[PDB]
Amino acid sequence: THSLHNAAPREALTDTIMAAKIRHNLTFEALAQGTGLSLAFVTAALLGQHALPEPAARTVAAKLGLDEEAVLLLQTIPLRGSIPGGVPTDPTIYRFYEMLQVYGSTLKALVHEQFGDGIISAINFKLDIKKVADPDGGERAVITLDGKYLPTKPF
Amino acid sequence: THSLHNAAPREALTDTIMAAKIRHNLTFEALAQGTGLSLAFVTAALLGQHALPEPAARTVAAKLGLDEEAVLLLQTIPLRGSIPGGVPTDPTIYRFYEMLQVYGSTLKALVHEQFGDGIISAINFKLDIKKVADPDGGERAVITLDGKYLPTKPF
Amino acid sequence: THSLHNAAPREALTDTIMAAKIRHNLTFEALAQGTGLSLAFVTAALLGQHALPEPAARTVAAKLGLDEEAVLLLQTIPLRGSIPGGVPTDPTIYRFYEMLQVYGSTLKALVHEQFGDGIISAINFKLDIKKVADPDGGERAVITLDGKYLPTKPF
Amino acid sequence: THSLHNAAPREALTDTIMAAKIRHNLTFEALAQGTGLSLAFVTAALLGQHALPEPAARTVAAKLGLDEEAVLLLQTIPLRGSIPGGVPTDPTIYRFYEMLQVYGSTLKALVHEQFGDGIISAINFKLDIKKVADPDGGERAVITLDGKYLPTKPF
Amino acid sequence: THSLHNAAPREALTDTIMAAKIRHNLTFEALAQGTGLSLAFVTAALLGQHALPEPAARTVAAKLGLDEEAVLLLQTIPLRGSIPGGVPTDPTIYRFYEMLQVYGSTLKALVHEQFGDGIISAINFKLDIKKVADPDGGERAVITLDGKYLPTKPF
Amino acid sequence: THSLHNAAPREALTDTIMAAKIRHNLTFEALAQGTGLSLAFVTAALLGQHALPEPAARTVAAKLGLDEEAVLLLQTIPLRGSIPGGVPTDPTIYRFYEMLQVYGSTLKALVHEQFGDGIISAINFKLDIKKVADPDGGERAVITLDGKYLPTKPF
Amino acid sequence: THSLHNAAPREALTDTIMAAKIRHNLTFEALAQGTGLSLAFVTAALLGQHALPEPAARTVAAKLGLDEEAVLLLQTIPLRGSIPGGVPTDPTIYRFYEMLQVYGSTLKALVHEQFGDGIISAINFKLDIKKVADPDGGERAVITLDGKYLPTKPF
Amino acid sequence: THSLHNAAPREALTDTIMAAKIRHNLTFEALAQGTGLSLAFVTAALLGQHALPEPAARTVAAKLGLDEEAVLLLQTIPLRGSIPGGVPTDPTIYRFYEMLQVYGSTLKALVHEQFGDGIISAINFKLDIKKVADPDGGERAVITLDGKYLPTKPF
Amino acid sequence: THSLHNAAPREALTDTIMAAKIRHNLTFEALAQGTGLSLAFVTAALLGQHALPEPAARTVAAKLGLDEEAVLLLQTIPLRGSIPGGVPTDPTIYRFYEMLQVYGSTLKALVHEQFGDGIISAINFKLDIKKVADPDGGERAVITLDGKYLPTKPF
Amino acid sequence: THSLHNAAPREALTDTIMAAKIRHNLTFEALAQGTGLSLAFVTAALLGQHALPEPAARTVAAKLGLDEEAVLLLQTIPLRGSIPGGVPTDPTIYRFYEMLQVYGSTLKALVHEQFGDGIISAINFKLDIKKVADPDGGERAVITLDGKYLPTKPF
Ligand SMILES: [Cl-]
Ligand SMILES: [Cl-]
Ligand SMILES: [Cl-]
Ligand SMILES: [Cl-]
Ligand SMILES: [Cl-]
Ligand SMILES: [Cl-]
Ligand SMILES: [Cl-]
Ligand SMILES: [Cl-]
Ligand SMILES: [Cl-]
Ligand SMILES: [Cl-]
C-alpha cells in the first residue's frame, strides 16, 4: 500500500480531523465504533501514526464529514513519531516518559530473566487503556502493553 | 528517611549486587521471594531506582552475601534515572521508548477523554511483566502500567 | 473534555487574546475578576497552559469581545509547555530557571527530609505571586509554590 | 574571598559530607542548628552551592567530624549548578522543572504587570520550604521564593 | 506596562524596521538621535530586545514611516534573546562569544576577588561601544560593560 | 612555541594553582604584581587560557611554590575554553552570557555601522575590570573589551 | 541468562580482550574459529554487543588467557550500543551512517512497497561481510543485512 | 551540472511526485521500468537524494504527468540527507539505525582486518533490497551494501 | 554599510538567484566575470555569505534578470552561516568537515610550531579551489586556504 | 593490521609522545625528518589520527627514547576524531571550523560545477601548511587541501 516519506501531509489531516471532532463534539469512542478495530489503533491512525484499512477510513470520514482526499490519506503508511523532539514537556505525556526513566533498567532485566536475550516487540504489539476504580478512592488507568517476544539467538 | 544527592553511590552498590547475582546464579524472582513486594519494585531498588524498607533490604543482602553498608544504602532514596541520556540505544529498552513515540499522542488523547484534564501518575504507580503464550506459537509479554489518575483542577 | 494534540491552535488564540488585552488596555487582574479562579491560573489559561471553565471563559471573552470560537478553544485541554526549548533566554524567566539550578538538590534533600520519599506535585498545585515592600527601599516578589505531597509507596 | 573555578573540589566535599550524614544518622535541620542561618541556605552550602561563614563551617564540621580542609572548602565561593545537564530526571526535582514549563509564561506576564519591566532576582533571594496539612487529608509543601525586583530602565 | 509572551511579533517588527532602514538609507545613529537615549539602548530596542518610551518610539517610527501597530509594539516589553540557539555562527557575533569562552573563568575569579560573592548584574546594566584608533594604524572597538554588583549574602 | 593538544594537562595545573592560592592566602592581584602584565591576562593564564612568558611564569610560580612542570606548562600554548559545555550555569558567569544574548544582534549592527564589514578581534584583544562606586549607593563593575577591527574585504 | 544493566563492565572486558589480542598478535578470524558461530557474531560479542554461549566463551578466553571473571562476563547479555553518542566521527564507521542518511527514505519506501506496512527486524537479523574482487581493479565489501519482515497489522 | 544549495526545492518536488504517485496508483518499480537504472537509485532520486540523467528524468516525469520544471529539477544535484535530525523515529527506518549502533564497532574492526586501513565507500556504492522467503514461515529482506574499499595510505 | 540581523531575507534571495541560474543555464564562473573578484567570493555572496560591492551587485542581478530590491539586498552584510546546524549531512560538504575532525589537532600543533601563539584568520582570508589532473588517472581538487597569522601577545 | 576500538589507548600514547617531544626540545619537523612521510601525516599520527609504518614508527620512537609498546601502538589503526564534541572551542581550531561554516555551501557549489556530482575525498587526501609573508607586513598560512574527486555515478 502507498507510504508517505514525511509527516507534513498527515499533520495537516490530523489538524483537520481534530477540527471536525471538536466542532461536531465527537469522541474517539464514537469514531472507532463500527470499524471493528480497537480504540487505541483507530485513535493513533487519526493522529497520523497508523494506516487505516479502507472500510474504517470511509466510516470515520463519514462521521466527521471528510473529503475524498482525507479517505485516501488515512490509508497511507505514515512516517511515525508523535512527540516532536523525542522528549515531551506536556505533563500527561511526560509521566509515561518518566515511567521509562525509572523502570527502563528493570524492564530489560526482567525480560532477559523471564524470556531471554531479545526484545519485546513494538510492531507485533497491542496497546489498550482501561479505566478502573481505585479501592482507596479515585480512578486508575490500566495501560496494557502486549508485545511478541523476539529472541536474539547466536548465528 | 535519608536521601542521596547523586547516583554514584547506588551505581557502585548495583555493580556489586550484579556481581554477586551472577556468581551465585540467582534470579530476580529468587531475590524478591519473601520480601512482600512485587518483582518490578524490588528489581528497581536493586538497580538503584527505589529505596527498600529495612526488612526487604536485609532479605536480599543475605541472599547475595552483602555487607551492612549494603542494606543501609539499599534503604536510601536514590537520585532516580536508569537511562543515561534519557533516550536509550539498547534494543530491549528502546522498544518501550518506541511505544512512547508512536502512542504518545494517543495516550494523552484517550486519557483526557476517558479521565479528563490531568495525568496518569508515575508515583502512585504499579508495574507488572507477565509471560503468556502466543496463539501463533511463541511467547508474548504483557506489561501492565497501573497509575492513579491525578486531575488538574482549577485554583 | 476535548483535548488538543498540538500547541498551534492555542498559540494563535493567545496572540488574539493578548492583542485584545492590549487594545482594551486591560490587566490580567481585571480579566480574572469575577471568575472565581486565582490570578495565576486564569493568566496561565489565557497563555494556553490551562483549560478555563465555561463561565470564566465567557467572562473573559465578553471583556475582550472575542467570538464564540474563542470560548470553545479556551475550554479545551491544551498541550502544555510555555518555554520553547525547555531552557529560557529571557532574563525574567531565566531567573526562575537559575533558582532551580542552585536549589534543585536542596529542594530534593529537604523534601525527602521533611516529607519522605515521593514528590511535591505540579498537578495538585497552586501558584501565587505577591508584591511586598523591601525594607532597604524598593519592592520584592513573594512567589508561593503550594503542592500536594505524593509519597512513593512500595508495591 | 576565595573562589573555585570548577565544581570537582566541592563535589568531593559534598560526597564526604553526605557519607558522614548517613552513617551518623544526622538531619539537615540538626546540622543547621546553632549556625544562625536558615535551613535552605545551610543545606545548599553542604550541597556545594553556597559559601558558609567560618562559624557555620566549623559548627557543621564538628557535627560531622570533618577535617580542617573541609572547613576551608566550605567557605570558598563555588561554581554553582546542582542539576547536571540543566534538566533533571529525578521525579522529585523534575516536578519543579515542570512547574517552570507551565507557569513560565505566566510568571513573566505577572511580573511585568505587578512590577514592570525587569526581573525578580535570584541573587537577592530567599528560599523557604514549609510543611502544611491538606484539607482533604495529607500534607502539602509551601515553597516560597522571595526575590528583589530589579527594573530594566532606559539608559 | 504591557508585555509580549512570544518573540514572533517583535521578530516581524525587526524585519520591517530593518527593511525600512535600508530603503531610507538611515543609520542607527540617525534613528536614535534626538530621543535622549543611548545608541546601544535604542538599537537594542529596535532589534526587539527593549521597550521604547512613546516619545522615543514615535520619533524613530516617523523616521522610518512605520505603521501604528509598530509604535505600540515598540513600547511593549519583549521576550528577550537575540541569538537563536544561544551560540552564534556569524563571525562578528561569535568573537564576543569567544571572549566569554576564554575569560569566563577570569571574570568570575576577579569579581569574587574585587567585589565578593555575588554577580555583576545584566539588568542594572549599561552598554556602550566606542571607536578608537590603534597606535599601529587601524581602528579598535572599546565596548564597555557597566553592571551593578549584587552580593550573595547568607539568609 | 610548544603547544598542548588536550585540556587535561592545564586543567590539573589550574586545580593546583587554585589550591596553592588558597593555602598562601594570596590574591590574583598579588600573583600578577611585579610581572609587568595586566591582571586579566595573568589570571587567565593561571586558569589555563593563556601562555605566560618565562620571566612572568617564574615570578608567579615562585609565589605559589609550583613544581618545575607547572613552570613549563604555564608557558605552553593551551587548548582554550574555560566554560565546559559552552553555556555556563554559575550565576556570576551567566550574567555575561546574558549580556551576549540581549546585545549580540546589537553589537553586530553597530560594528558594521561604525566600522564596516568585519569583526572585533578576540585575539588582538585587551580585557580590564575596574571597580567604581554607584551614586545610588553600592559598587559597579566597568569591564572593558578592547579589540582591533579586522575588516572583511573582497578577494 | 544473566544480563548487565550498564555498559561499563563490558567496556573494561573489551579493552582487556583487545589488549590481549594485540599483545598476543591474534586475529578475529582465529578467535572465532572452533566456536561454531559466525565471525560477525563472535567479534560483536568481544566488542560487548552479544552474549557468548559457554563453550564459545571458554575457547575465546583460553586463546587470550583470560580469567574466570571473563568467561562469566562474556556470557552475560550486555547493554548494547557500540557508537558513543549515536553518530560516529571515525570515517570507517561514518560511511555506514552516511548510507543511512541517503537511503533511509528509500529503504522505508521500498520496504512498504515490496513487503507492506511494518519493519525489517534488527533482532531476527544476521550480518555478513564478504570480500569480493572489484572488476575495476581493487576490492569491495559486500555487507549483507538479512532481517525478518514484521508487518504492522490492525488491531 | 547544476547543484542545489538547500533541500526545500527538491522537498516540494518529492511532495508533488508522491501526490501524483498515489492518484495514479503507480509503484516505484513501475516508475523505474525502462530507465536502465536500479530500483534503489531511482527511488532515491525521486525522494530527493540523487540526480536523474535526462532520459530517466523524462520517462518518470511522463508517467506521473509532471511539468517541465519537474524534469529540470529531477536532474539537479540535491543537498543530500533524507533523515531530518540524523536519528530517525519511524520504526522502519530506525531498525537500520539500530543495526549501525550494535555492529558499528564490529564493522570497523573487521574492515581493518579483512581489507586494511581505510573505508568502505558510500559514494562508490550500490544498494539492493531483495525479498526472500523465511524457511520458518514468513518473508525476509536481504539488503546488500556493496562499497569499494578505499585505503588510507601515507603521503 | 547596511547589515542584516537575521538570515531569512538573504535565504529567499539565494533561492531566487539559484532558480534564475538554473533557468538561464548560467554558471558561477559566468556570474563572477567582470567583477574583479575571485570565484569563491562572488559564489559565497550569491549564497548569502558576503556583501557585494555595489557595481558587482548590479551586473549579477542583470545577468539573472532580478529586480533592484535584490541588488540592494545583495549589498547588505549578512548573518553568516551556510551549514544549518553546524554539522552537514550532504556528503560533499561532510568530507570537509571530516578533514577538520582528523587534522584539527594537527593544524593547531603545526600553527603554533611554525607561527607561534595565535590563530590563522578566517576573516583576513582567501579561498581558492583549483582543478588539477591526477597523475594516476582521474581528477583532484586543490583547495587553498590563505589566512593571516594573528599572534596572541600578552597585555 | 591491528585496529583500536576506542581512542583512550592512543590518547595515552599521544600524551607520552608530546611529553618526550618537549623534553628533547624537538619539533614536528625534526620528528618527521628521515621518515619519508609528509609533516602533516606524521604529526597527525602522533596525535592519534593515523597509523605509522614500522620504519617511521621506529625512527620516531628512537628520537624520543620510547619503549617497544610505543612502536607497536603507533602502527595500529586508531579510532579517528581529534575534536572532542565535533565543534571546537579553542580559537586556533575554531577558525577552520568557521571557514567551513561560511564557505561550506560555496565548496559544494563549485565542486559540482567544476567536477560534477560527487565528493572531494578525505581519504585520498593530502594536507600541507606553508608559511608566506604578508605584503603589508606580517605572516600568512597557506593550507592546501588536495583531495581526489570521487564521482557519484548512477547504478
Ligand atoms: Cl519491534
Ligand atoms: Cl505523578
Ligand atoms: Cl505531579
Ligand atoms: Cl539576578
Ligand atoms: Cl542581573
Ligand atoms: Cl579574532
Ligand atoms: Cl526488530
Ligand atoms: Cl566514500
Ligand atoms: Cl579571525
Ligand atoms: Cl572520502
Is residue G57 within 8 A of residue G7, CB to CB? The reply is no
Provide the 10 A C-beta neighbour count for residue I21.
21
Sheet containing D139-151: order of strands: C118-133, C139-151, D139-151, D118-133
- Cell representation of residue E71: 509604535
Per the document, the length of chain A is 155
Is residue B128 within 8 A of residue G125, CB to CB? The reply is no
C-alpha closest to that of C47 among C25, C85, C73: C73
Which residues of chain G does A151 touch, with a Cβ-Cβ cutoff of 8 Å? 123
Which residues of chain D does C28 touch, with a Cβ-Cβ cutoff of 8 Å? 109-110, 113
Q: Residue C108: helix, strand or coil by DSSP?
A: helix
Task: Specify the residue for cell string 560526597.
Answer: D15
Pick from C108, C118, C155: CB nearest B41: C155
In angstroms, the CA B59 to CA H37 distance is 68
Is residue G26 within 8 A of residue G63, CB to CB? The reply is yes
Is residue J105 within 8 A of residue H5, CB to CB? The reply is yes
Non-local (6+) Cβ contacts of F90 within 8 A are D79, D80, D81, E108
C-alpha closest to that of D21 among D42, D1, D36: D42
* Angle in degrees, 0-180, between the axes of helices C8-23 and C54-64, rounded to the nearest 10: 50
Query: E strands of I43-82, at which residues?
Result: none
Pick from E95, E100, E121: CB nearest F119: E95
Residue A52 DSSP one-character state: P
Instruction: Tell me which residues of chain I have a C-beta less than 8 Å from any C-beta of chain E.
Output: 2, 4-6, 8-9, 72-73, 76, 79-81, 86, 122-123
In angstroms, the CA F56 to CA F35 distance is 5
State the amino acid at position J80 in one-letter form. Answer: R
Rounded to the nearest 5°, which phi and psi values hold at J126?
A: -125, 140
Which residues of chain H does J2 touch, with a Cβ-Cβ cutoff of 8 Å? 112
**Burial (Cβ within 10 Å: 0-12, 13-18, ≥19) of residue A27:** middle
Q: Residue F140: helix, strand or coil by DSSP?
A: strand
G98 assigned to active site = yes
Q: How many helical (H) and strand (E) elements, i.e. helices and strands, does chain A have? A: 6, 2
Q: Do residue H22 and residue A2 have CB atoms under 8 angstroms apart?
A: yes
Is residue G90 within 8 A of residue H120, CB to CB? The reply is no
Non-local (6+) Cβ contacts of D90 within 8 A are B79, B80, B81, C108
List the end-to-end C-alpha distance of chain E, in Å, as a whole number: 32
In angstroms, the CA J8 to CA J17 distance is 14
* Angle in degrees, 0-180, between the axes of helices H39-46 and G91-114, rounded to the nearest 10: 90
In angstroms, the CA J63 to CA D111 distance is 68
Task: Specify the residue for cell string 537577592.
Answer: D124
The per-residue DSSP string of F9-22 comes to HHHHHHHHHHHHHH
Q: How crowded is the C-beta side of H36, counted as CA atoms within 13 Å? A: 10
**Burial (Cβ within 10 Å: 0-12, 13-18, ≥19) of residue J47:** buried
**Burial (Cβ within 10 Å: 0-12, 13-18, ≥19) of residue H7:** buried
Non-local (6+) Cβ contacts of H132 within 8 A are H139, H140, H141, H142
Is residue B142 within 8 A of residue A144, CB to CB? The reply is yes
The subunits that touch chain I, with at least 3 C-beta pairs less than 8 Å apart, are E, F, G, H, J
Residue E125 DSSP one-character state: E
Chains C and J touch (3+ CB pairs under 8 A): no
Q: From the candidates B105, B112, B131, which should be mutated to test the interface with A, based on the most A CB atoms within 10 A?
A: B105
Per the document, the length of chain F is 155
Specify the pairing of strand A118-133 against strand A139-151.
antiparallel
In angstroms, the CA I12 to CA D121 distance is 42
| Residue F124 host element (H or E) | strand F118-133
Residue E122 DSSP one-character state: E
The number of the ligand nearest the C-alpha atom of B124 reads 2
Is residue D99 within 8 A of residue F108, CB to CB? The reply is no
B98 assigned to active site = yes
In angstroms, the CA D135 to CA D147 distance is 29
CA dihedral sign, ordered F32, F35, F38, F40:
negative
Is residue J60 within 8 A of residue J74, CB to CB? The reply is yes
Chains J and B touch (3+ CB pairs under 8 A): no
Q: Which residues of A108-124 are buried (b: 16+ CB within 10 A; e: fewer)?
A: bbbbbbbbbbbbbbbbb
C-alpha closest to that of A29 among A60, A54, A57: A60
In angstroms, the CA F83 to CA E107 distance is 11
In angstroms, the CA F40 to CA E110 distance is 8
Provide the 10 A C-beta neighbour count for residue D34.
13
Is residue I101 within 8 A of residue G89, CB to CB? The reply is yes
Is residue G60 within 8 A of residue G31, CB to CB? The reply is yes
Rounded to the nearest 5°, which phi and psi values hold at F7?
A: -95, -15
Is residue G78 within 8 A of residue G45, CB to CB? The reply is no
Non-local (6+) Cβ contacts of A4 within 8 A are A10, A76, A77, A78, A79, H18
The number of C-beta contacts closer than 8 angstroms across G and I is 9
Q: Residue E10: helix, strand or coil by DSSP?
A: helix
Cα C101 to ligand 3 centroid, rounded to whole Å:
19
Q: Mind telling me the catalytic residues of C? A: 95, 98, 121
- Cell representation of residue D9: 573540589
Specify the pairing of strand D118-133 against strand E118-133.
unpaired
The per-residue DSSP string of C56-78 comes to HHHHHHHHHT--HHHHHHHTSBP
Is residue E89 within 8 A of residue I81, CB to CB? The reply is yes
In angstroms, the CA E4 to CA D112 distance is 10
Provide the 10 A C-beta neighbour count for residue I130.
12
Q: Residue H125: helix, strand or coil by DSSP?
A: strand
The number of C-beta contacts closer than 8 angstroms across G and H is 225
In angstroms, the CA F77 to CA J66 distance is 24
Which residues of chain G does H109 touch, with a Cβ-Cβ cutoff of 8 Å? 28, 43, 47
Q: Mind telling me the catalytic residues of F? A: 95, 98, 121
Helices (H), F54-145: 54-64, 68-75, 91-114
* Angle in degrees, 0-180, between the axes of helices D54-64 and D39-46, rounded to the nearest 10: 70
CA distance A155 to chain C (A): 40
Q: Which of G69, G80, G121, G140 is catalytic?
A: G121
In angstroms, the Cα distances linking C55 to A76, C32, C59, C65 are 42, 12, 6, 15
C-alpha closest to that of I100 among F120, J84, A66, B79: J84
Which residues of chain J does H112 touch, with a Cβ-Cβ cutoff of 8 Å? 1-3, 77
H121 assigned to active site = yes
- In C, minimum Cα distance to E121 occurs at C91
Pick from C18, C47, C89: CB nearest E80: C89
Nearest 5 degrees, angle CA E133-CA E139-CA E143? 90
Query: E strands of J40-138, at which residues?
Result: 118-133
Provide the 10 A C-beta neighbour count for residue A105.
27
In angstroms, the Cα distances linking C23 to A149, C66, E67 are 61, 12, 16
**Burial (Cβ within 10 Å: 0-12, 13-18, ≥19) of residue C137:** exposed
The subunits that touch chain H, with at least 3 C-beta pairs less than 8 Å apart, are A, B, G, I, J
Cα B133 to ligand 1 centroid, rounded to whole Å:
18
Cα A124 to ligand 7 centroid, rounded to whole Å:
10
CA dihedral sign, ordered J3, J6, J9, J14:
positive
Is residue D74 within 8 A of residue D2, CB to CB? The reply is no
Chains E and B touch (3+ CB pairs under 8 A): no
Q: From the candidates F25, F82, F90, which should be mutated to test the interface with D, based on the most D CB atoms within 10 A?
A: F90
In angstroms, the CA I4 to CA I68 distance is 17
Dihedral over alpha carbons C63, C69, C71, C75 (to 10 degrees): -160
In angstroms, the Cα distances linking B87 to A85, D92, F8, G81, H130 are 11, 20, 29, 12, 32
Beta bridge partners of J146: I142, J126
- In F, minimum Cα distance to C94 occurs at F98
Task: Specify the residue for cell string 539559484.
Answer: I18
Q: Do residue C118 and residue B118 have CB atoms under 8 angstroms apart?
A: no
**Burial (Cβ within 10 Å: 0-12, 13-18, ≥19) of residue A58:** middle
Q: Residue D75: helix, strand or coil by DSSP?
A: coil
Which residues of chain C does A99 touch, with a Cβ-Cβ cutoff of 8 Å? none
**Burial (Cβ within 10 Å: 0-12, 13-18, ≥19) of residue C148:** buried
Non-local (6+) Cβ contacts of G4 within 8 A are B18, G10, G76, G77, G78, G79
Query: E strands of chain D, at which residues?
Result: 118-133, 139-151
**Cα D37 to chain centroid, rounded:** 12
Rounded to the nearest 5°, which phi and psi values hold at H2?
A: -75, 140
CA distance C80 to chain A (A): 5
Nearest 5 degrees, angle CA F35-CA F37-CA F38? 125
Q: Which of E29, E82, E98, E140 is catalytic?
A: E98
Which residues of chain F does E125 touch, with a Cβ-Cβ cutoff of 8 Å? 99
Provide the 10 A C-beta neighbour count for residue E8.
12
Helices (H), chain A: 8-23, 28-32, 39-46, 54-64, 68-73, 91-114
List the end-to-end C-alpha distance of chain C, in Å, as a whole number: 32
In angstroms, the CA C27 to CA C39 distance is 10
- In I, minimum Cα distance to E47 occurs at I5
C-alpha closest to that of F100 among F138, F145, F131, F141: F145
In angstroms, the CA H95 to CA H97 distance is 5
C-alpha closest to that of E81 among E21, E4, E145: E4
Cα-only R_g, chain D = 18
- Cell representation of residue B55: 526488612
List the end-to-end C-alpha distance of chain B, in Å, as a whole number: 32
**Cα B24 to chain centroid, rounded:** 23
Is residue J61 within 8 A of residue J28, CB to CB? The reply is no
Beta bridge partners of D120: D149
Is residue F50 within 8 A of residue J92, CB to CB? The reply is no
Chains E and F touch (3+ CB pairs under 8 A): yes
Nearest 5 degrees, angle CA A60-CA A63-CA A66? 75
- Cell representation of residue G27: 586475529
In angstroms, the CA J25 to CA J32 distance is 14
In angstroms, the CA G99 to CA E99 distance is 39
In angstroms, the CA E89 to CA I86 distance is 8
In angstroms, the CA C120 to CA D96 distance is 8
The beta-carbon contacts of D34-42 under 8 Å, at least 24 apart in sequence, are D34/D59, D35/D59, D35/D60, D37/E154, D37/E155, D38/D126, D38/D128, D38/E155, D39/C110, D39/D129, D40/C103, D40/C106, D40/C110, D40/D126, D40/D127, D40/D128, D40/D129, D40/E155, D41/D127, D41/E154, D41/E155
Provide the 10 A C-beta neighbour count for residue A59.
20
In angstroms, the CA B106 to CA D69 distance is 56
Non-local (6+) Cβ contacts of I14 within 8 A are H5, H6, I46, I47, I48
Q: How many helical (H) and strand (E) elements, i.e. helices and strands, does chain E have? A: 6, 2
- Cell representation of residue C46: 489565557
Cα D108 to ligand 4 centroid, rounded to whole Å:
14
- Cell representation of residue E39: 545608541
Is residue D85 within 8 A of residue B7, CB to CB? The reply is no
**Burial (Cβ within 10 Å: 0-12, 13-18, ≥19) of residue B122:** buried
- Quick one: three-class SS letters along chain G? CCECCCCHHHHHHHHHHHHHHHHCCCCHHHHHCCCCCCHHHHHHHHCCCCCCCHHHHHHHHHHHCCCHHHHHHHCCECCCCCCCCCCCCCHHHHHHHHHHHHHHHHHHHHHHHHCCCEEEEEEEEEEEEEEEECCCCCEEEEEEEEEEEEECCCC
Q: Residue A71: helix, strand or coil by DSSP?
A: helix
Q: Which of E29, E38, E54, E121 is catalytic?
A: E121
- Cell representation of residue J73: 601502538
The subunits that touch chain B, with at least 3 C-beta pairs less than 8 Å apart, are A, C, D, G, H
- Cell representation of residue C67: 467570538
List the domain boundaries for chain D.
1-87, 88-155
- Cell representation of residue H38: 536500479
